[PDB]
């Protein structure tokens, strides 16, 4: 089994890693083994003097605080966004652009970005007056929680993977990670995309040239957001599993809504679902516009990702036997 797991991990730098197989082979530890592999490959243990046992202990605890019973927002998703961010960081157009600390920030933000997700949306938590929505005053409720948990876990026994960073490095990493994870709040999508467009319009090359924090952090925010919305750009066997998982999670939120006598949210009604038309809409109004802009920023590095996305759209279009539009307006606008 150890030999087979290592053969799968050989694809860690490739778009389309068999992350589900890795989850099976690791005894459901895809986040831990993927993060460890990535930390080794990028020499981040040596650079930031992170003891290996400390890394593993944090990683295992982080992974335990992802909910295994939640169908999509679980440790397998987290592992995937980590690995996708890892690949995007190595695109040719960004060679030598980011420091090691910025790289660590992006990867760490990706690892914690959904930790302790309950499998229901921000709008559900707000509308049911949940404890979390009360704690966070209705704004980026989940994302503020993921951050709080991700950092609090560093305080458990032998979990402080940032113990040998300088005070300035810790502060700077924490500021970046907060900015990145808050930008994963889906309601920020349109503003993020607008800002990414504007940056592409004024971009300078030599490989991209990024002069200031503001431009660098924008690119990292968008990167991780692209990684979070990367499933439809993956090989179709992977995409299809991610779609089945997200619909299961949504339909479960619908069932909770139904039991409380609430109006069933768009995309959450298992009795009135249009899975394939809804993916086509998601790709057309959200994922293709974002990834086309990312592809411009890194031109021509992301051409194959775009082509896969377009092929994957045709497949869902071809398997069709209020809701999309209401879901989009409520989810991706401020
Ligand atoms: C198969 C990949 C996938 N991922 C995401 N990601 C996503 C969208 C919204 C949220 C917020 C939430 N409701 O939890 C979270 C993730 N959304 C979808 C989706 C599904 C149906 C319809 C739409 Cl517009 C989007 N599909
Ligand atoms: Mg999230
Ligand atoms: Mg409580
Ligand atoms: Zn996510």
Coordinates of N, CA, C and O in Angstrom, one line a residue, residues 28 60 71 96 99 110 115-116 118 138 145 147 179 194 213 236 259 271 284 292 301 332:
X28 N -7.8 7.9 4.6 CA -8.4 9.2 4.6 C -7.6 10.3 5.3 O -8.1 11.1 6.1
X60 N -2.3 16.6 11.1 CA -3.3 15.6 11.5 C -4.5 16.2 12.3 O -5.6 15.8 12.1
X71 N -20.2 16.2 2.6 CA -20.0 15.5 1.4 C -18.9 16.2 0.5 O -18.2 15.5 -0.2
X96 N 9.8 32.8 -10.0 CA 10.6 33.7 -9.1 C 9.9 35.0 -8.6 O 10.5 35.8 -7.9
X99 N 8.0 35.4 -2.9 CA 8.9 34.9 -1.8 C 8.5 33.5 -1.2 O 7.3 33.1 -1.4
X110 N -4.8 27.9 1.8 CA -5.5 26.8 1.1 C -5.8 25.6 2.0 O -6.9 25.1 2.0
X115 N -11.8 24.8 7.0 CA -11.8 23.9 8.2 C -13.0 24.1 9.1 O -13.5 25.2 9.2
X116 N -13.5 23.0 9.6 CA -14.7 23.0 10.4 C -16.0 23.5 9.7 O -16.8 24.1 10.4
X118 N -19.6 23.3 8.4 CA -20.7 22.5 8.8 C -21.5 21.9 7.6 O -22.5 21.2 7.9
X138 N -22.9 38.5 10.8 CA -23.4 38.2 9.5 C -22.4 38.4 8.4 O -22.8 38.2 7.2
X145 N -14.7 32.1 10.6 CA -14.5 30.9 11.4 C -13.4 29.9 11.0 O -12.6 29.4 11.8
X147 N -10.6 30.7 9.5 CA -9.4 31.4 9.9 C -9.2 31.2 11.4 O -8.1 30.8 11.8
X179 N -6.2 37.8 4.6 CA -6.6 38.4 3.3 C -7.0 37.3 2.3 O -7.9 37.5 1.6
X194 N -13.3 41.7 -11.0 CA -13.2 43.0 -11.6 C -11.8 43.5 -11.3 O -11.1 44.0 -12.2
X213 N 2.8 45.1 -2.4 CA 2.0 44.2 -1.7 C 0.6 44.0 -2.4 O 0.1 42.9 -2.7
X236 N -12.5 15.0 -16.4 CA -13.9 14.8 -16.2 C -14.3 13.8 -15.1 O -15.3 13.9 -14.4
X259 N -37.4 20.5 6.9 CA -37.8 20.1 8.2 C -38.1 21.2 9.1 O -38.8 21.1 10.1
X271 N -36.0 17.3 -5.0 CA -37.2 17.0 -5.8 C -37.3 17.9 -7.0 O -38.2 17.7 -7.8
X284 N -20.6 28.9 -17.4 CA -20.8 30.1 -18.3 C -20.8 31.4 -17.5 O -20.2 32.4 -18.0
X292 N -10.8 32.5 -17.7 CA -10.4 33.2 -18.9 C -9.5 34.4 -18.5 O -8.5 34.6 -19.1
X301 N 0.2 30.1 -20.2 CA 0.4 28.9 -19.3 C -0.9 28.1 -19.0 O -0.7 26.9 -18.7
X332 N -22.7 34.8 -5.5 CA -21.4 35.4 -6.0 C -21.4 36.9 -6.1 O -20.4 37.4 -6.6

